[PDB]
Write a protein that binds this ligand. Structure first.
Ligand SMILES: O=C(O)c1cc(C(=O)O)c2c(n1)C(=O)C(=O)c1cc(C(=O)O)[nH]c1-2
Ligand SMILES: O[C@@H]1[C@@H](O)[C@@H](O)CO[C@H]1O
Ligand SMILES: O[C@@H]1[C@@H](O)[C@@H](O)CO[C@H]1O
Ligand SMILES: [Ca+2]
Ligand SMILES: [Ca+2]
Length: 334
């Protein structure tokens, strides 16, 4: 369905001056919530003006290296329950909490005390994963990393190097591949992107080491090969990527599905990748857009129809931040 050749138009800059923006949760009314990894804040961005409101600081966050306040996601029933979920690196682990958001409260006081729904994910200075999202099945999904310990990914008993699927209350999701376990898929290095297509099939981005970054089509119980395999050609028993990229051209974090393609934000690549899909295969060659125009790109989210939100990441410790960084852009895509 999507054309082989795509396009990306930057309609406008929506907001500026964000610090280490990471998680992005589009609100029903058109506004955005954005987390800061290193400041541990969640901030509301007014879509029209770019005006920023600090909701508050998430308690218990311990930023260091790639860890800190990471993915955020609205409850599937957010419109009525006003619950915001957050994945973050604590003193001891990575974990997921939920907080009651009340926009009628003073700035800084808008987040209720966190309810911890899931704990115990391995942490390190690197490879903490951190992207969370609710699937069309109303279950909570989380990408993790192996924390720099390559031995965790293949170990079904370790929460490191996995995609997890749980109830919103933090219990293993009914119908998961392994009895009593929140593990959905394994053999992952570091996963910071999740998105579903129109047929409710999950895709995930992944950072490779020095050779191949990945876009994977995720099936429950499948083994994506890390650390014995990296990129395509993993061998029998391993599930290969839909597409792979050199680490200098990608190093991908967030992904979004829109207009029949996966859109993938590249950090080191400083570019937005388009992967048009036919079923769970690439329909045509992936194409990159915006290379070096806005620096590092971390997060991309659907804004409805042919529109995307895109978040830069030049303030995350590995960029050269320019005046006004980091920013959110509005894109119109094909
Ligand atoms: O191979 C690379 O050049 C490269 C670059 C980056 C980056 O641009 O920050 C990451 C990685 N690799 C990587 O493997 C990884 O897990 C990772 C996590 C992050 C992040 O900032 O959260 N960046 C990177
Ligand atoms: O190193 C390059 C950088 O200069 C920019 O072009 C983005 O892509 C990276 O591979
Ligand atoms: O039928 C598939 C549809 O599900 C979508 O993936 C686009 O490609 C078509 O061939
Ligand atoms: Ca890498
Ligand atoms: Ca793999």
């Amino acid at each position: 369905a999507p054309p082989a050749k795509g396009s990306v138009k930057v309609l406008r800059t929506v907001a500026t001056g964000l610090n280490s923006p990471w998680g992005l949760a589009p609100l029903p009314g058109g506004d955005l919530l954005v987390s800061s990894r290193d400041e541990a804040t969640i901030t509301r961005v007014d879509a029209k003006t770019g005006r920023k409101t600090e909701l508050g600081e998430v308690p218990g966050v311990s930023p260091s290296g790639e860890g800190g306040l990471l993915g955020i996601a609205l409850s599937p029933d957010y419109a009525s329950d006003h619950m915001v979920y957050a994945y973050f690196t604590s003193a001891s682990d990575n974990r997921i909490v939920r907080m009651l958001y009340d926009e009628k409260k003073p700035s800084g006081e808008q987040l209720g005390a966190p309810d911890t729904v899931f704990r115990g994910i391995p942490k390190g200075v690197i490879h903490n994963g951190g992207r969370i999202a609710f699937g069309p099945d109303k279950m909570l999904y989380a990408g993790t990393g192996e924390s720099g310990d390559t031995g965790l990914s293949q170990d079904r008993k370790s929460l490191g190097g996995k995609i997890l699927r749980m109830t919103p209350d933090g219990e293993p999701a009914p119908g998961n591949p392994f009895p009593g376990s929140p593990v959905y898929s394994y053999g992952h290095r570091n996963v910071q992107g999740l998105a579903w297509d129109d047929k409710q099939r999950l895709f995930a981005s992944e950072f490779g080491q020095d050779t191949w970054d990945e876009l994977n089509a995720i099936k429950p119980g499948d083994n994506y090969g890390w650390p014995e395999a990296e990129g395509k050609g993993g061998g029998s028993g391993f599930h290969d990527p839909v597409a792979q990229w050199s680490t200098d051209e990608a190093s991908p974090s967030g992904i979004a599905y829109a207009e029949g393609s996966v859109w993938m934000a590249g950090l080191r690549g400083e570019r937005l990748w388009r992967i048009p899909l036919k079923g769970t295969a690439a329909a045509a060659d992936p194409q990159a857009f915006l290379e070096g125009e806005y620096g590092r790109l971390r997060t991309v989210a659907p804004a409805g129809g042919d529109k995307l939100w895109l978040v830069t990441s030049n303030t995350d410790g590995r960029g050269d931040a320019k005046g006004g960084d980091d920013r959110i852009l509005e894109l119109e895509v094909e």
